[PDB]
Amino acid sequence: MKTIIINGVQFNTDEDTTILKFARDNNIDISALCFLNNCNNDINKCEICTVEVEGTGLVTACDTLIEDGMIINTNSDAVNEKIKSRISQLLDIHEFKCGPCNRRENCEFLKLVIKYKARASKPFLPKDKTEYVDERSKSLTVDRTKCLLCGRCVNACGKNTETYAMKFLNKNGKTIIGAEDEKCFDDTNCLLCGQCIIACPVAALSEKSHMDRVKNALNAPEKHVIVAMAPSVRASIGELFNMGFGVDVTGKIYTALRQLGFDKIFDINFGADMTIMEEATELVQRIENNGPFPMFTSCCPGWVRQAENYYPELLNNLSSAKSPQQIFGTASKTYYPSISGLDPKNVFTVTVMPCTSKKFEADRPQMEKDGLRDIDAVITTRELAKMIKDAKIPFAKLEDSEADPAMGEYSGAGAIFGATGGVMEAALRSAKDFAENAELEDIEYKQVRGLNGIKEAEVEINNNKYNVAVINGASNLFKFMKSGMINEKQYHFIEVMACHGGCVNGGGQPHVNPKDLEKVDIKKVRASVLYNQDEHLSKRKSHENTALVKMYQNYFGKPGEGRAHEILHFKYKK
C-alpha cells in the first residue's frame, strides 16, 4: 500500500493511478487542459495540471503516477503562478475575441483564463485569418487563431480512428495541426468524422459552415426550403439550451424550425425507414442468392471513406441503398414535387445532422439526378442551435408541434438509427418479416445494442442461422479486420459506424465538459431517448410506416428493383 499526503490530508491507498485522477476521485481540484480520456500532449505538455511534489518540485499531475511517500500540494503560490504563466503564454497565441466566437458559451480555455485571471503579454490580433483558417474541406474547418497546440484532436483521432489523419506539422519552423502534407483533409485518409472537433477545448476546430447556404435559401423568395433532422438531434440539442441530458425535444425542434422560416418540416427518420425498406429487401435477396456476403451497411459516410481509403475491396459488398439523408433527399426532388406541385429546381433540401461527414456525403458529385442535388445543405446540431439562439427563439419555452407527415412519419425502427446497433436492429425487424412472409411480434435485438466496440449475434431467419456483427467506431473496424476476426466465421450482415456510440456521439454534436462527462455517460443517455421513442411508438417496423407505404405504392413501386433501385440506390464502388 501507499501513503499519499495531498494538501495535508493523508490517503492510504492500493490504487495505481495518476495524481490527477486520484485527486479528482477524492474531491481535490486540479486543473487540466491537454489531458483528455487518459492521454495528454506528450511533447510540449501544457502543464496546467501542475502540482508540487515535495522533494521533487513542480510536476504534471495528469501523467505522474502516485507513489508511496509523496507529499503533494495543489494550490501553493508557486503552483498557481506556473499555471497562470502557461495560460498567459497561450493567450499570446490566441485571438481572444469571445463575442463572435462559436465556443463563447462553453469554452474550456475561457474558463481557465477566468479562473486564473490570466492576460496576454501582447494581444494576439491576427491580420490574415485567410492564412490561419483552412476551410477547404467539405466537412471540417481549422481556425488556428484559436489553436492551443494541446494535441487533443491528434489524440482523439488516433484513439477513435487510428488513422492519425490529424497531425502536428512543421510549417515554416512553427508547429501547427493539420492534415498530412498540409493537404485538404478530404484529399487524405481522413474519415471526416469530426471526433477531433469534439475533443477540441476551443473554437479552433469546427464544422464546415453551411449556415450561409441555409440562410440564403430561406431568404430567397423562390426557394422552398425543406428541413429534416437526424434521429440523434432530438436527443441532444436541448443540452445547448441548459435543459439537461437525455431530454426528448422532438416537438420543440419542429416548432423552432417553423419559427426559423423553413417551408416544410420533415424528418430523416422517414428516410431511415426508406433505407430499411431497400436494405432489408437487399439482405433478403442476398440470403436467397447465398451472398455476396458479408453485406456491410453503407449509411455512415465516415465508414464509406474508411472503406474507400483502406478497404476498397469491400465496396462491392456495401449495401447499395442510399443513406437516410441521401435517400430522403432523392425523394425530396422527385416524389415531393409530385405530391406538392413545387418546381423541383426550387426545392432546397436541408438536413440537421449530428455529423460532419454528412456534409461531404451531401456534396458528393454523383449525389444528384438531372441537375438537382439530393441534399443542398447540411447543418450540424451545433449549427441549428446557433441559428435558434441568433433568432432569439426561446427554445426551452416552446410548445410542441408535429412534422408534416408525408415525409415526416417514422417508425420505431427508424427512430433508433442514431445508436450503435440501431440500423442492425431496424434492418433485422424488416428482413425477418420479409423472408418469413410473417408479422413477427418479437422484434427486440438487445444483443446488438450497447457500447462494446465489436458486437455479434447469431440470428434465425426463415429456419436458417445467420451471423451479424456491429462494428462500433472506426478504430474497431480496423481491429475487426486486422485481427482477422472477420475470418473466424462467415458473417452475413455487418453494421459499421465511424463514431463510437453511433451518431449520438457524432462529430457535429454538442460539446460536453469533461467534468459533466465524469458524471454522465453521454452515449447511453442520448441513445436512451431513441430507444424510448421506439418503445412508445405504435409502429416499430419501417415497412409499417403509413406515409412511406403510400409513397412506394403511388410513386416508387416495389423496393429493391426497378424505379426504386434506379434512383434510391447508389453504386459506391464505381
* Of the candidate residues 253, 469, 494, 530, the single one contacting a copy of itself (CB under 8 A): 469
Should residue 406 be labelled a site residue for Cl ion when binding is judged by CB under 5 A? yes
* Of the candidate residues 28, 200, 469, 494, the single one contacting ligand SF4 (CB under 6 A): 200
Tell the smallest beta-carbon distance from residue 300 to ligand 402 (Å): 4
- At residue 246's C-alpha, the angle toward residues 241 and 248, to 5°, is 75
The separation between CA 303 and the C-alpha centre of its own chain, rounded to angstroms, equals: 12
Tell the smallest beta-carbon distance from residue 504 to Cl ion (Å): 13
Which run of H or E residues covers position 229?
Answer: strand 224-229
* Of the candidate residues 4, 19, 23, 62, the single one contacting ligand FES (CB under 6 A): 62
- Window 416 to 455, contacts with Mg ion (CB under 5 A): 452
* Of the candidate residues 302, 408, 412, 510, the single one contacting ligand SF4 (CB under 6 A): 302
* Of the candidate residues 366, 463, 487, 538, the single one contacting Cl ion (CB under 5 A): 366
Q: Cell 459533466 belongs to which residue?
A: 516
Helices (H), 262-343: 268-288, 301-310, 324-332, 335-338
Which of the ranges 103-111, 221-229, 254-262, 515-523 carries the binding residues for ligand SF4, by CB under 6 A?
103-111
The separation between CA 451 and the C-alpha centre of its own chain, rounded to angstroms, equals: 15
What is the rounded CA–CA span in Å between residue 395 and residue 230?
Answer: 18
* Of the candidate residues 84, 138, 152, 373, the single one contacting ligand SF4 (CB under 6 A): 152
Nearer to Mg ion, 452 or 554 (CB): 452
Should residue 164 be labelled a site residue for a copy of itself when binding is judged by CB under 8 A? yes
Cβ proximity of 422 and 277 under 8 Å? no
Tell the smallest beta-carbon distance from residue 177 to a copy of itself (Å): 8
Helices (H), 406-466: 412-415, 422-436
What is the rounded CA–CA span in Å between residue 228 and residue 264?
Answer: 9
Q: Cell 403511388 belongs to which residue?
A: 554
SS3 (DSSP) at 4: strand
C-alpha cell at 10: 493523508
SS3 (DSSP) at 444: coil
Report DSSP letters for 486-535, one per residue.
GGGS---EEEEESSTT-GGG-TTSPP--HHHHHH--HHHHHHHHHHHHHH
* Of the candidate residues 26, 29, 37, 42, the single one contacting a copy of itself (CB under 8 A): 42
- Window 12 to 51, contacts with ligand FES (CB under 6 A): 32-35, 40-41, 45-49
Tell the smallest beta-carbon distance from residue 170 to a copy of itself (Å): 4
What is the rounded CA–CA span in Å between residue 239 and residue 243?
Answer: 6
SS3 (DSSP) at 465: strand
Should residue 367 be labelled a site residue for ligand 402 when binding is judged by CB under 6 A? no
Should residue 65 be labelled a site residue for Cl ion when binding is judged by CB under 5 A? yes
Should residue 202 be labelled a site residue for ligand SF4 when binding is judged by CB under 6 A? yes
Angstrom CA distances, 54 to 2, 71, 73, 97, 240, stand at 16, 6, 8, 39, 43
The separation between CA 371 and the C-alpha centre of its own chain, rounded to angstroms, equals: 29
Tell the smallest beta-carbon distance from residue 16 to a copy of itself (Å): 5
Tell the smallest beta-carbon distance from residue 234 to ligand SF4 (Å): 15
* Of the candidate residues 47, 63, 273, 433, the single one contacting Mg ion (CB under 5 A): 63
C-alpha cell at 462: 426463415
* Of the candidate residues 204, 253, 299, 426, the single one contacting ligand 402 (CB under 6 A): 299
Nearer to ligand 402, 110 or 230 (CB): 230
Nearer to Mg ion, 101 or 485 (CB): 485
Tell the smallest beta-carbon distance from residue 39 to ligand 402 (Å): 25
Let me know how long the chain is.
574
Q: What is the DSSP letter of 166?
A: S
- At residue 111's C-alpha, the angle toward residues 106 and 116, to 5°, is 175
C-alpha cell at 193: 468524422
Tell the smallest beta-carbon distance from residue 48 to ligand FES (Å): 5
Q: Which does 49 bind (CB under 5 to 8 A by kind): ligand 402, ligand FES, a copy of itself, none?
A: ligand FES
Answer whether the bond into residue 221 is a cis peptide, omega within 30°. no
Helices (H), 92-240: 108-116, 129-132, 152-161, 195-199, 211-219
Tell the smallest beta-carbon distance from residue 162 to a copy of itself (Å): 8
Which of the ranges 124-132, 224-232, 404-412, 451-459 carries the binding residues for ligand 402, by CB under 6 A?
224-232
SS3 (DSSP) at 386: helix
Q: For the window 489-528, what string marks contact with ligand FES as x by the rule CB under 6 A?
A: ----------------------------------------
Residues interacting with a copy of itself, by CB under 8 A?
14, 16, 42-44, 56, 63, 65, 151, 154-155, 158, 162, 164, 167-170, 175, 446, 450-456, 469, 479-480, 482-485, 487-489, 519, 521, 524
Residues interacting with Mg ion, by CB under 5 A?
40, 42, 63, 218, 452
Residues interacting with Cl ion, by CB under 5 A?
65, 364-366, 404, 406, 450-451
Residues interacting with ligand 402, by CB under 6 A?
230-232, 268, 272, 299-300, 323-325, 353-355, 358, 417-418, 422-423, 497, 502-503, 506
